Design a protein around this ligand. Structure first.
Ligand code: K
Ligand code: K
Ligand code: K
Length: 266
């Protein structure tokens, strides 16, 4: 990664890199607004668009998908990225498009799905598709939501709110919960999500904040773990990330805490 970011060291990814693990031979689908495949610092191995008004997955007219891609590669520099466009330039999409992306990911033997997207209400049909992905062995990671708090109510967005999905909230560089990061019993782990510098469309770079930025740290961590332990199931990868996280506070706000990929990979 050409842009410096504190998040990679924060989750202890350099310890894996020192051990010689960089996520080789791990297929990571980024279900988002596309990936700018012409960016000099990205390589994209394949993809598909399901957004009828935006038919190229290898361009990104929003910026999120590219940024997210860059984070996954900063964490797991050898991962293979797949651009699955399920959101348009406004970062919005239909539930069916998300389903078609998930199905494409299953058909094309992805190891990890990253969904940095969140609907407040969810879709029964999306649930079925994510659960199917997880049953087929895919590690499914999603942004917990940028809906802050709501007293004692959960604010975790769908599809993160489903139990089959790893819901990733955002901490800042001080390991404090970001004011926007959703909360609730469904929140699983935290990762860096404030002012994360990564790739942007048109060969650019810049900081973005959100649980969408936290999620790909965890998708990259999953790739690092699978490169060290290619025989582990998705169940085993998830368990390793949740069980070895660094506790940060009440699980309503922090889940199990900050992922620690060095501990998870032991
Ligand atoms: K490129
Ligand atoms: K969850
Ligand atoms: K929780």
């Amino acid at each position: 990664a050409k842009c410096v970011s504190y998040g990679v060291a924060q989750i202890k990814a350099p310890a894996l890199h020192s051990q010689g693990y960089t996520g080789s031979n791990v297929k990571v689908a980024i279900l988002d607004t596309g990936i700018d495949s012409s960016h000099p610092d990205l390589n994209v191995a394949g993809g598909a668009s399901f957004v009828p008004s935006e038919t190229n997955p290898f361009q990104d007219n929003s910026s999120g998908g590219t940024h997210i891609a860059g984070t996954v590669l900063a964490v797991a520099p050898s991962a293979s990225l797949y651009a699955v466009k399920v959101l348009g330039a406004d970062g919005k999409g239909q539930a069916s498009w998300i389903i078609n992306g998930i199905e494409w990911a299953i058909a094309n033997n992805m190891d990890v799905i990253n969904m940095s997207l969140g609907s407040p209400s969810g879709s029964a049909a999306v649930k079925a598709a994510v659960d199917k992905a997880v049953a087929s062995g895919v590690v499914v990671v999603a942004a917990a939501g940028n809906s802050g708090t709501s007293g004692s109510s959960s604010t975790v967005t769908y599809p993160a709110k489903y139990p089959s999905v790893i819901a990733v909230g955002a901490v800042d560089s001080s390991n404090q919960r970001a004011p926007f990061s959703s909360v609730g019993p469904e929140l699983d782990v935290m990762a860096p999500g404030v002012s994360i510098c990564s790739t942007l469309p048109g060969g650019k770079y810049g900081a973005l904040s959100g649980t969408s930025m936290a999620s790909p740290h965890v998708a990259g961590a999953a790739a690092l773990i699978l490169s060290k332990h290619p025989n582990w199931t998705n169940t085993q990868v998830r368990s390793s990330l949740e069980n070895t996280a660094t506790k940060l506070g009440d699980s309503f706000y922090y889940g199990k805490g900050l992922i620690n990929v060095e501990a998870a990979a032991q």
